[PDB]
Nucleic acid binder design. Structure first.
Ligand SMILES: [Zn+2]
Ligand SMILES: [Zn+2]
Ligand SMILES: [Zn+2]
Ligand SMILES: [Zn+2]
Lengths: 196, 195, 192, 191
DNA sequence: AAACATGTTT
DNA sequence: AAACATGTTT
DNA sequence: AAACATGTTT
DNA sequence: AAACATGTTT
C-alpha cells in the first residue's frame, strides 16, 4: 500500500528537528522551519535530532523512508538513479546497497531493508537514548542522489518519512518533511523562499 | 581509430540536408558550413544521400559516431547508463539499448558492435533514389543529449556516414559534427553568434 | 620509530590509486604524494597475490617525514578535536588523524607504550572479479593546522599485519591534506 | 550590550595618537584600530568633570555583524592552552582583552549572559596631563580558526560607576592581526 | 616591505 | 577558476 | 558568489 | 519564445 505520511506524535511524543544552519557561504545543508523542507548537497552528511518524552520499548528502531510528494508518483518507489548506483564512487563502503537513496553513517547496527512485497527501500537504526544531559538523539544521514537526477527523480518533489517503530514493526510515531538534495542548498533555499 | 577524412569515393558519395527554418522550434536544423547539425533527443532526422554511379550489391551505409576531440577519439560512444534502462525508447527492443544512433523506418537495418574495437554502428542496405529524385533519405534518431551525465558530457562528437560494400571495404565517406540537444534553435543561432 | 621501508611482503602487498575543476583529492604517480581536502573521503586500492592469514588486518598510520619530528606523534590539532564538527560519529576518537569510513569492524587503537595512534581494518578479499580491495579514508586535519602539523611534511604507513600483529607487508606514501589539492599539486610539480 | 556612543555627564572620551612595522596603528575616521597579537596598546581617556568613587572602566569586546552579536567573544581553543601568554595566570586563559600594568584590574565574566570583560579603577590624569592612558593586550588574531574567523569585532570601552550603572561609553572597531601596517594602508586603499 | 603559502570568497 | 585575505618567510 | 550551460516549465 | 531550474565554471 502507499506509506502513511500523516504526522503522528505517538504515545512517547516522537518529534524530530534540526538547528542552526546559517548561509555560511555554502553550508553543506540547511532546513526551513515552516516549509518542513530541507536542502542539502549530495553525499554530504546531515544531522537530525530525535526528541522523546516517555522511553520506548525494546526493539525501538527508527525507519527512515523516502517517497514522492506528488500524487501520480506516490505509486512509484525511490531508488538511486542507474548512474550513481554503478559509478562506484560512494560504493566502496559496500555496507549499503548501491540502490538505496538514504544512508545512515556512523552506526554499525543500522540495517538496510527492502520490503519484499512492495519493493520499498528503507533504513533501520536501533534507538539509543539521548546523550546523558541532552534530550535529542542525533542521527547521521546521507542522501545519494540529486533530487534532479536524470532517470532517478527528475526534480520530482520527494519527502522523507522518519518513523519510530517497535520490535515487531508496528508504528509508535511518525514525522515527516520534504527534502531537496541538490547542489547549492544555499541558493535553492533563499531563491526558493523568495518566489513566494 | 576510424577515419574521418572526407572521401567522395568512386561513385561520388555525397550527403546533405535541406530547409530547416527556425520554425519556432524545429525538431532539428543544420548549418551549411559548420557541417554541424543540432537536433532534439529521440526526434527523427532526415539525411539525403546522392550518388553519380550506381554502387555494388552489398551497398550498405554505416552510420557511426565518435568524438571530435583528440584525447577522446580513443573512447567509444554509447548511450549513458540512465537512458539505456529508463525503458522509454526501449520498447522497440529491435535496437540495443546502448547504441546512440538508430535508423527508423527500415526493417533491414542491422545494429552491429565491432567485437574487436567495441565500436557500435548501424548498417542499412542502400536503396536507389526515388524514381525522379536523386537523394536517398534515411531516418536517424539520436538517443542521448550530447551533454548527458556520464555519457558525453558536452564532449563535441561527430557522425561518420559511410558507403560500404558487401565485404565491408569503404566506397565513400562523408562526415559532420552533431549536437543532439534541447533547443537546436537557440544552440544554433546562439552558436553562430559567438563568432 | 616505526619502519618506513617499502616491504612487498610474501603475499606481494601493494597499494595504488587511479583536475576535475576541484577534485576532492588527487595523487602523483612518482612523488608517491597524495593531496586531498579536509574531511572529504579518499579511496585506496589494495592488491595481493597470495591470500593472507586469518587476522589479516590493515593498519594505517601517520608519521612525520622530516627527521627531527619522527620522534613526535601525529594527533589532530586542539581545535579540530573539540569543534564538535566531524565529532558526532563519536565512533572515532576526536584525536586521531586518520579515519576509515564505511566499515563497522574498523577499530581505532592508540599504542599504550609509544602513544602512537593508528586504525585497523579487517582484510576482506577483493570484489569477485576485481583484485583491489578499496578502503575509505578520511583525514581530519589540514597538513598545516596551527599547533598540529604546521605544514610539516607527513606520510602515511599502510601496512598489512597478521592476527598477532607481526608485519606481513608495508607500503608508504606522503600525504598533504590541504585545501585545493588541485593547485597545490600542479603548482607543486611545477616548482621543479 | 549597547554600542551607541554616549558622551556621558563627565564627557567621557577616548583617543589615541601618533602611530606612523609599528606594533599597532589607529585610523581617525574608521574608528578602527589594528594591532599585532599580544603586543601592548595604549588608549587615552579624557574627562571634563571628575567621576564618582567606584569610577571603573570596563572594556568589552563583541561582534560588529548582526547574526553574531548574539555570540560571545572568547580566545580560541588553541591560544587558551598553548600556555604561552598563560604564565601570568592572573588573567583567565579565555578572555580576549587584558590590561597590563595595573594590579587592581579584575577580570569578570557575567554569570547570566556569559559575556567576559575587564574592569580597571579610574585613576585621574597625570598631574599636568588630561588623558589617563590604559594598557591593553589582545590575545587572539581577529582571524583565529574557531575563534573569530575574521569576523569584524569591536571594543566597548565604558566608564561605569561603583554600583555598575553606565556613566559614559565610546566604541571602536579592532582588528588584531599580523601586519597592522599593511592591513591598514591596504585597507583604506580598497575604498 | 615584498613575496609567498594557503584557506575562503566571489 | 580567479581574486583575495592573512600570517609567515625571505 | 556570480556567470554560464542547458534541459523543462510557463 | 521567454523565464526559469539546476548543476558546473570561473
Ligand atoms: Zn543519481
Ligand atoms: Zn543519455
Ligand atoms: Zn586541525
Ligand atoms: Zn587564537
Amino acid at each position: 500500500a502507499s506509506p502513511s505520511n500523516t504526522d503522528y506524535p505517538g504515545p512517547h511524543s516522537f518529534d524530530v528537528s534540526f538547528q542552526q544552519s546559517s548561509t555560511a557561504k555554502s553550508a553543506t545543508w540547511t532546513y526551513s522551519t515552516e516549509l518542513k523542507k530541507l536542502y542539502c548537497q549530495i553525499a554530504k552528511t546531515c544531522p537530525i535530532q530525535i526528541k522523546v518524552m516517555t522511553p520506548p520499548p525494546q526493539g525501538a528502531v527508527i525507519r527512515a523512508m523516502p517517497v514522492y510528494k506528488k500524487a501520480e508518483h506516490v505509486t512509484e518507489v525511490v531508488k538511486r538513479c542507474p548512474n550513481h548506483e554503478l559509478s562506484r564512487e560512494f560504493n566502496e563502503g559496500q555496507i549499503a546497497p548501491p540502490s538505496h537513496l538514504i544512508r545512515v553513517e556512523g552506526n554499525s547496527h543500522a540495517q538496510y531493508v527492502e520490503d519484499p512485497i512492495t519493493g520499498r527501500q528503507s533504513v533501520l537504526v536501533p534507538y539509543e537514548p539521548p546523550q546523558v544531559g541532552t534530550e535529542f538523539t542525533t542521527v547521521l544521514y546521507n542522501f545519494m542522489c540529486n533530487s534532479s537526477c536524470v532517470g532517478g527523480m527528475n526534480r520530482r518533489p520527494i519527502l522523507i518519512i522518519v518513523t519510530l517503530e517497535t520490535r515487531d514493526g508496528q508504528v509508535l510515531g511518525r514525522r515527516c518533511f520534504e527534502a531537496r538534495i541538490c547542489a547549492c542548498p544555499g541558493r535553492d533555499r533563499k531563491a526558493d523562499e523568495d518566489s513566494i
